[PDB]
Structure formats: structure tokens, C-alpha cells
């Protein structure tokens, strides 16, 4: 098991570059049992676990899950695609979103 800090010291923030998080994930093999940790200041960002469509269009309403208090720690316990976005402001629209593929432990 591996523990990942989404974004690095950049943490979970509004990116200057729209592909930042695509870049951060790349080269990482997320497996079942691994844990993602999103760090941010209270109210400045958040985490909503969404479907692929909601991910693509940045739909904030009807999350699978939604978390607001800062480290949001999520364990990956199923194989397959997982999508996360920040619903605060225009953050998702400018790239604060994460797409990963979880494989076996
Ligand atoms: Cu945000």
C-alpha cells in the first residue's frame, strides 16, 4: 500500500496549467488498498467523487461522494476508473480534476 499526496507540494489547488493533474498521475500505478490524500485550506477547495460524464463536464450536482474538510483521505478499494473534481468556483473548468485507473493489489 501506497499513500499518495495528490498534487505534490502543489497539493490540491486551482492549477495554472490545465494538464497539471493529468501530469501528476502519470507514471503512478494506483492499486487496491492505496490511499489518496487531498490537501487544501477549508472552504477554498473540496472533493467530489463523480462519474466520468460529470468529470468531463464538471457537473458538481449529485456527487457519488462529496468532502469539504481538509486532508480528504480516500482509500481505493475497487479496481477501475475513478474521477475526482473540485466543485469550488471555476476550478474544475480550469483543470482541478483527477482521473485515475485502479488495478489489483
Ligand atoms: Cu478548488
UniProtKB/Swiss-Prot annotation:
Organism: Armoracia rusticana (Horseradish)
Residues where Cu cation binds: 45, 86, 91, 96
Keywords, alphabetical: Copper, Disulfide bond, Electron transport, Glycoprotein, Hydroxylation, Metal-binding, Transport
General function of this protein: Probable electron transfer copper protein that serves as a direct electron donor. Does not show any activity towards ascorbic acid, p-phenylenediamine and several common 'classical' substrates for copper proteins.
Domain Phytocyanin: 2-104
Gene Ontology MF terms in the entry: electron transfer activity; metal ion binding
Cystine connections: 58-92
Name recorded for this polypeptide: Umecyanin
GO annotations of cellular component type: plasma membrane
Post-translational modification: Glycosylated at Asn-77. The carbohydrate content was determined to be 1.2%, corresponding to one hexose sugar per molecule. Strongly heterogeneous at the C-terminus with the majority of the chains ending at position 106.
Residue positions with a glycan: 77
Cofactor note: Binds 1 copper ion per subunit.
Cofactor: Cu cation
Entries under Pfam families matching the protein: Cu_bind_like (PF02298)
Lineage: Eukaryota, Viridiplantae, Streptophyta, Embryophyta, Tracheophyta
InterPro entries, A to Z: BlueCu_1_BS, Cupredoxin, Phytocyanin-like, Phytocyanin_dom
